[PDB]
Every structure is written in C-alpha cells, then in structure tokens.
C-alpha cells in the first residue's frame, strides 16, 4: 500500500514516496537517479509544482489546462530556465490528474532533448484506496505528455472492466507523436495493473514497437495513469486520465 509507479529507465528516474510526510507512503515522488548526492534525493511532485510556479518569470510554468471537462496541472521546468546549481536535475514535464494522488509525466538530462537515449518517462500515484469494477464499462478523459510542456496529446480511454481491457487513442499537435494508439492493453478484471502494446504515429511515421504499462488508481478507478515506451525514445510518451 501507498505510491505505485514506473519508471521507463530505473538509471535516469526512479518513483516513490516522499520522506518524513504527514501521509507516509501517499505523496508521490521523483529521484533523479542519474544525478549524484545531493540531486539524486526523491522530491515530491507537489514541491516540483512549487518550483515551476517560482522559476515561472524565468521560462517555468505551471498551468491548470482544461481537457474536456477535466483539468490536468502541467508543470513544465527546462534546465534552460532553473539556476545553474539545479543543471544536474535536468529538465521535467509532468502532469496531475485534476487534483487526485496521480502524476505522469517525462524527463531528460540536461544538454539532451526529448530525442536522446535519456528521455524517460514515468507515472506515479497512490494506490491505498484503489478499487476496480468487475463489470460494466466507463471512459476516461486522458492527457499525454511526449516531448513538451505546452502542447499535449488527449482522448478518450475505454475501460471494459469485465473483458479486463483498455482501448483507445490520444491525438496531439506540436509533440513527436501526433497519435498513440492502445494495443491489446489488458488487465484481470478487479484488479488495476495493466499492460500492453501500442502504436505510435508522428513525425518518424508509425511505430508499432509500444509497450505500455499503467494501472487504474483511486476509489471505483476514479483515474489511470501510465508510460507507452518505443524503440523510437523521441515518441516515449507518459499519460494520466481521470474517469467521467
């Protein structure tokens, strides 16, 4: 019980939870791991949001965006913008679903771009109160980040609780991907991990080389969140959706 996530590169970024926390085990958290002491610390995604708002006059930002009807805060914190001292962290763009215990989002080192070995993406989010249908169906509004803080991909997800199946695709301009499709992305029914394959498109052309990994979070799977990995790094793509 407490945070569950994925990191698509344990080397650059591994998730967890915050230390010393009012709420042990329920606040999501970031560590550089491809930074040495002190930056290799796990930071909580909430104290990041802080800092995209404060570094904000210098190129950060921080912005509640309104999908549909949900709402996703995107942080958006390039090297370019922080204090040299924090080069090390590198640069993070990373999303909440709404104001649920649910964060996605992508990093990559400082000097590369989204297209470097280095981009990696991750989710994170706290699992205590998850509960998953063993029937039924519902949808998901959901946000994707690949490469950028300022243009996102969105859809819809569609959750067959009895089948155990996720299906769908997000869509998006500005970003590598220009569409990402679910590709056999199952799970047991009333349980919440799921797993899949997926194809890309965008601006190499298809890839048909995605793997996702995610899982349901929250009371009645209230939100989702999870990474689809490519051979092609430049389409790494981490997303999060809150059910309607």
Do not use: C, R
């Given at each position: 019980?407490?945070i ?8 650059n970024?591994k ?8 709420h ?6 970031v560590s550089v ?8 610390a796990?930071?909580?995604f909430?104290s990041?949001?802080?800092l ?9 930002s921080?912005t509640n965006?309104?999908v ?6 995107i942080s ?14 590198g640069?993070?763009?990373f999303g909440q679903?709404?104001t ?10 400082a000097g ?5 070995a280095?981009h990696?993406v991750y989710?994170?989010?706290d699992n ?6 063993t029937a039924?169906?519902?949808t998901?509004?959901?946000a994707g980040?690949?490469?950028?803080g300022?243009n996102l991909?969105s859809?819809t997800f ?11 695709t997000?869509?998006g301009?500005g970003?590598?991907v ?5 590709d056999?992305?199952?799970?047991n029914?009333?349980?919440a ?13 298809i ?12 009371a ?7 990474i689809?990995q ?14 309607n």
């Amino acid at each position: 019980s407490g945070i569950d996530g994925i990191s698509s590169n344990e080397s650059n970024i591994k998730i967890g939870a915050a230390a010393n926390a009012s709420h042990p085990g329920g606040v999501a958290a970031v560590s550089v791991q491809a930074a040495g002491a002190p930056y290799n610390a796990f930071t909580g995604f909430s104290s990041l949001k802080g800092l995209a708002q404060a570094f904000a006059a210098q190129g950060t930002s921080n912005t509640n965006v309104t999908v549909g009807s949900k709402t996703f805060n995107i942080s958006h914190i390039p090297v370019s913008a922080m204090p040299p001292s924090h080069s090390a962290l590198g640069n993070f763009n990373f999303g909440q679903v709404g104001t649920q215990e649910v964060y996605f989002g992508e990093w990559w080192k400082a000097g590369d771009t989204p297209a470097s070995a280095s981009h990696t993406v991750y989710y994170a989010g706290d699992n205590t109160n998850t509960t998953v249908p063993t029937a039924g169906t519902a949808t998901y509004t959901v946000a994707g980040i690949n490469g950028s803080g300022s243009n996102l991909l969105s859809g819809t997800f569609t959750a067959n609780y009895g089948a155990g199946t996720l299906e769908g695709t997000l869509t998006g301009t500005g970003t590598a991907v220009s569409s990402l499709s679910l590709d056999g992305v199952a799970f047991n029914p009333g349980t919440a991990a799921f797993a899949g394959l997926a194809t890309a498109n965008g601006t190499a052309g298809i890839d048909n080389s995605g793997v996702v990994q995610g899982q349901f979070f929250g009371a009645n799977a209230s939100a989702l969140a999870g990474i689809a990995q490519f051979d092609n790094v430049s389409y790494n793509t981490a997303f999060g959706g809150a059910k309607n």
